[PDB]
Design an enzyme around this catalytic site. Structure first.
Site, PDB file in Angstrom:
ATOM      1  N   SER A 203       0.823  -1.181   0.000  1.00 19.15           N
ATOM      2  CA  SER A 203       0.000   0.000   0.000  1.00 19.15           C
ATOM      3  C   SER A 203       0.881   1.265   0.000  1.00 19.15           C
ATOM      4  CB  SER A 203      -0.954  -0.079   1.165  1.00 19.15           C
ATOM      5  OG  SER A 203      -1.790   1.052   1.157  1.00 19.15           O
ATOM      6  N   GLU A 327      -8.927  -5.250  -3.564  1.00 18.96           N
ATOM      7  CA  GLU A 327      -8.205  -4.096  -3.069  1.00 18.96           C
ATOM      8  C   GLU A 327      -9.132  -3.044  -2.508  1.00 18.96           C
ATOM      9  OE1 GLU A 327      -5.142  -3.410  -2.815  1.00 18.96           O
ATOM     10  OE2 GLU A 327      -4.074  -4.947  -3.940  1.00 18.96           O
ATOM     11  N   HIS A 440      -7.048  -5.661   0.765  1.00 20.89           N
ATOM     12  CA  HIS A 440      -5.846  -4.876   0.834  1.00 20.89           C
ATOM     13  C   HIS A 440      -5.106  -5.152   2.156  1.00 20.89           C
ATOM     14  CE1 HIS A 440      -3.779  -1.281  -0.508  1.00 20.89           C
ATOM     15  NE2 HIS A 440      -3.861  -0.783   0.719  1.00 20.89           N
TER      16      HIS A 440
END
Ligand SMILES: O/N=C/c1cccc[n+]1CCCCCCC[n+]1ccccc1/C=N/O
Ligand SMILES: O/N=C/c1cccc[n+]1CCCCCCC[n+]1ccccc1/C=N/O
Ligand SMILES: *[C@@H]1O[C@H](CO)[C@@H](O)[C@H](O)[C@H]1NC(C)=O
Lengths: 535, 533
Positions: A203, A327, A440
């Site tokens: 990320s 995600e 995510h």
């Protein structure tokens, strides 16, 4: 020193460190935790680039994680593992410029490829001391030297009055760079090979990693890069100098504050005050937007990450990039009305259209409609399960998958060996609801081999899978190639190329090569949306 | 004299001809005038009803084809010529053809009125593919087809003028419909069961009739094959008709009255000479003289009319062929030809999109391009070629149809939709065009039942199925065989389910979503992209 364990004493440029012998499932690892690599960025040093840590006298205890950089602490779902697992697990402090080193125990005979983890957390949170970033498994199982650093996040890391001396911006990146500089200098004292440093990060960490790819002074500090679910390009990883200025001055306004006067005043503001207010500077109601992120200062970032990926020569770079299956899902519960961790979050068309606006905050009405029209399943335009998932996808695609696709392509197009993956395994232990798929950040525990810890209740399939992933990541660190150079029987991970756009599924099943990283939809976001915004 | 071939219609007596269809005789009454020849001062004018005639009018041969551009792209090529006029070109062409069973129906037999296509610039009810004998013989259908004026003659409009009010080709059609209403009973036709069907411009015409109130009392069911009144080519605005008419008139040396009067002085071929030259852009699937939104025949744009129409007691069969767009590509899209595999470059694709979607801004076109590019094989010629086909077919037919289907379904019409996916074994066009625009017609008309035509056995059976769907639909408004049990059933198209069937050699397969995602692009997005330039 006398009765101390001899393997735990190491000297770095700043002095002597006593690390700690950690138990990993397969045996001991050496952990040197809380090694300061910068002068504490406090008082007048807030918003300032990190100054390298001054040597200390005597043996610096490196047996415990140091402070986590001051950050907003997620309280969306109090005491819910799915959120708390990402929350600071040490004291919040601006004095937080420490890093952590795991190495085999005893320390490797021969210089070992180094893995430097850069956590994510949207540039407003994170900590290298989180359980999921535990380097012990990579160290123990892969023999890897794993380095993770705290870098300043939030205002402390990224508040920028671009052009100024006192708040130049990107200082959290500069922390990261400093920690990279540190590894370069010191890692050999742990048997880390400074000539084989692989950044990996997820990320914002992935974004930060990408930014080191893109920032010259960083480039000599690592050799390979893994970007997990994040890229320096994309709609959230950076802000213009103008926008950073706008946010920094706004934040200043919010907390009670020429550039010097303003920073000086921010510097008198207690850390928590900055944190309490940082969220309040975002231009729109948004998810996957963070208030204080890397700024395109023309310095750290000489240009937008888009310009830099689209034009940079990445001949000498091996990049492993990838995404999780879902995600977007995680983000939806933080502000898209209709989404919750506690129900199925089946949404209405209205809530989809609304969600698209929040999820694509920069989108004009036309763009948002484009998005909507693209993500609507026109066979069941009203199906709330589809709408929910389209919403996930919109957010996921826009912020991660398509930025990643774009990155993989731009990199591949300009010389990088790029390996691309989609990670599709939902941890059996995930506390986020089923609907969120593989959110995510939930590949990390696998890359780190947490499932190797039998106390952690993963399935044996997950143990094996984690082992596979660690093999990939570390093979990649070692060689620039995730593939097992010995285990040819196993399916192969082909580089991602612009022509073939090959990437692998990472799941319990053996490697499946897939073509085109969400190619149609990414053409929408990477090619078409820009044009729609620009008219 | 064969009493079965003598028919007293309103305007007098007609002698038909007994034609042989493989299963037996059909009575054909070809070349029946239904209007005063729209010649001289009557050029561009609404057809006037045909004056009654003395004695027995010979209706045994097709009458003239309305004056029209003759396609000469591939001279003497079955694929092009089969659409070319097969009778003399004349402005005097307002004639219709009735096929009936022989002997003529004992009781009022459902009527199928076929309205040919030809982009409103061409066509003829006399083409072999419109041969009504099979439907007549096998299905006992009374089949009617009319010539209607095409090109300038049918659609040159100076909107608001008395002398060229536009839509006269549609009025020709309407007049043939009225004629059917007044006369088909004499042939055994049931004027209370009249199904219009048409393909392409014909289908759009049928659409127009659906959308025009005076037409509504002249038919009960409609079949729109590969064409719709809505969409980018079927209509022009009044202002655009005016501009094209006054452009044409400029091109041929010509105040409406005087302009039209001068146009009226012009040899038919002089008009057709310049027909093509009045289109605003380098086009394919765009025609110079088409129905105009006159606020009369079409009280509003087809868009508006389909959006707001009441279609409660309407049954509509609509469909498309697998490759709606391929046919048009050879006619102006560089890189495309019937002779090579037309494997195009990306450039050629981008360029082809500007031609295929001539109304598109750069952004709109980029949007088309980005949409139809296989980003996995972005430069792949087979893909780009097929995408080009698709761009053109979808923009021009498939998505208009999907939208017609949906608006009609929503507006209370009973809608059956299909996609026709079977390529005639006898098709002369190259494989890459797959199932081109118009190559279902031969099947619907039952030509494969003509064993001289060399269709496969499978295709004869298939044409049989299609004739059953079409006439069943004509009979009942439901294309399903009320005698056959599991076939399986062709479900109505609804906005909810979007069910349509594949018409191919395999049994009906029900599918959902007529290029739903892509048509959303075309029907929902693209307009917003033009609605903001
Ligand atoms: O109410 N918001 C307060 C605030 C204040 C200052 C900075 C940010 N916020 C929100 C946080 C948004 C994003 C939440 C993401 C939480 N998260 C943590 C760890 C791993 C993943 C995630 C989210 N994934 O979607
Ligand atoms: O070169 N063209 C000259 C011209 C002159 C005056 C009016 C129109 N044009 C265009 C005609 C081409 C389009 C030919 C289409 C052939 N066709 C015939 C019947 C049914 C279908 C088709 C084509 N489908 O693609
Ligand atoms: C996992 O399962 C074990 C053994 O059944 C149990 O004692 C423990 O409470 C669980 N802990 C975790 C980390 O899930």
């Amino acid at each position: 020193e006398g009765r101390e364990d001899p393997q735990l004493l190491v000297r770095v440029r700043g002095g002597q460190l006593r690390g700690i012998r950690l138990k990993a499932p397969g045996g001991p690892v050496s952990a040197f935790l809380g090694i300061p690599f910068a002068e504490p960025p406090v008082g007048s040093r807030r918003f300032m680039p990190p100054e390298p840590k001054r040597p200390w006298s005597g043996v610096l205890d490196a047996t415990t994680f140091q402070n986590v950089c001051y950050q907003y602490v997620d309280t969306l779902y109090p005491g819910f593992e799915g959120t708390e697992m990402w929350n600071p697990n040490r004291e919040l402090s601006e004095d937080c410029l420490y890093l952590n080193v795991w190495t085999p125990y005893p320390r490797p005979a021969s210089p070992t490829p180094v893995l430097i983890w850069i956590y994510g957390g949207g540039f407003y949170s994170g900590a290298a001391s989180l359980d999921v970033y535990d380097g012990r498994f990579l160290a123990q199982v892969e023999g890897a030297v794993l380095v993770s650093m705290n870098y300043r996040v939030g205002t402390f890391g990224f508040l920028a009055l671009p052009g100024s001396r006192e708040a130049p911006g990107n200082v959290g990146l500069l922390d990261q760079r400093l920690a990279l500089q540190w590894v370069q200098e010191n890692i050999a004292a742990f048997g880390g090979d400074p000539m084989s440093v692989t950044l990996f990060g997820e990320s914002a960490g992935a974004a930060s990693v990408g930014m080191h790819i893109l920032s010259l002074p960083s480039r000599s500090l690592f050799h390979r890069a893994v970007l997990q679910s994040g890229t320096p390009n994309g709609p959230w990883a950076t802000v213009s100098a103008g926008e950073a200025r706008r946010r920094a001055t706004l934040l200043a306004r919010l907390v009670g504050c020429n550039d010097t006067e303003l920073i000086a005043c921010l510097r008198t503001r207690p850390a928590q005050d900055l944190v309490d207010h940082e969220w309040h500077v975002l231009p729109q109601e948004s998810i996957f937007r963070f208030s204080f992120v890397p700024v395109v200062d023309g310095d750290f970032l000489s240009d937008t990450p888009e310009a830099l990926i689209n034009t940079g020569d990445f001949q000498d770079l091996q990049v492993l990039v990838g995404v999780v299956k879902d995600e977007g899902s995680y983000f939806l519960v933080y502000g898209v009305p209709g989404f919750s961790k506690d129900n199925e979050s089946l949404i209405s068309r209205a809530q989809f259209l609304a969600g698209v606006r929040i999820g694509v905050p920069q989108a004009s009405d036309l763009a948002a409609e484009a998005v909507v029209l693209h993500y609507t399943d026109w066979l069941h335009p009203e199906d709330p399960t589809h709408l929910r998932d389209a919403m996930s996808a919109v957010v996921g695609d826009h912020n991660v998958v398509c930025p990643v696709a774009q990155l993989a392509g731009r990199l591949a197009a300009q010389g990088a060996r790029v390996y691309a993956y989609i990670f599709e395994h939902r941890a059996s232990t995930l506390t986020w609801p089923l609907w969120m798929g593989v959110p995510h950040g939930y590949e990390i525990e696998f890359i780190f081999g947490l499932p190797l810890d039998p106390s952690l209740n993963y399935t044996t399939e997950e143990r094996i899978f984690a082992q596979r992933l660690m093999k990939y990541w570390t093979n990649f660190a070692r060689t620039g190639d995730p593939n097992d150079p010995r285990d040819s029987k196993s399916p192969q991970w082909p580089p991602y190329t612009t022509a073939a756009q090959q990437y692998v599924s990472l799941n319990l099943k053996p490697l499946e090569v897939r073509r085109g990283l969400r190619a149609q939809t990414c053409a929408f976001w990477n090619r078409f949306l820009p044009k729609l915004l620009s008219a």
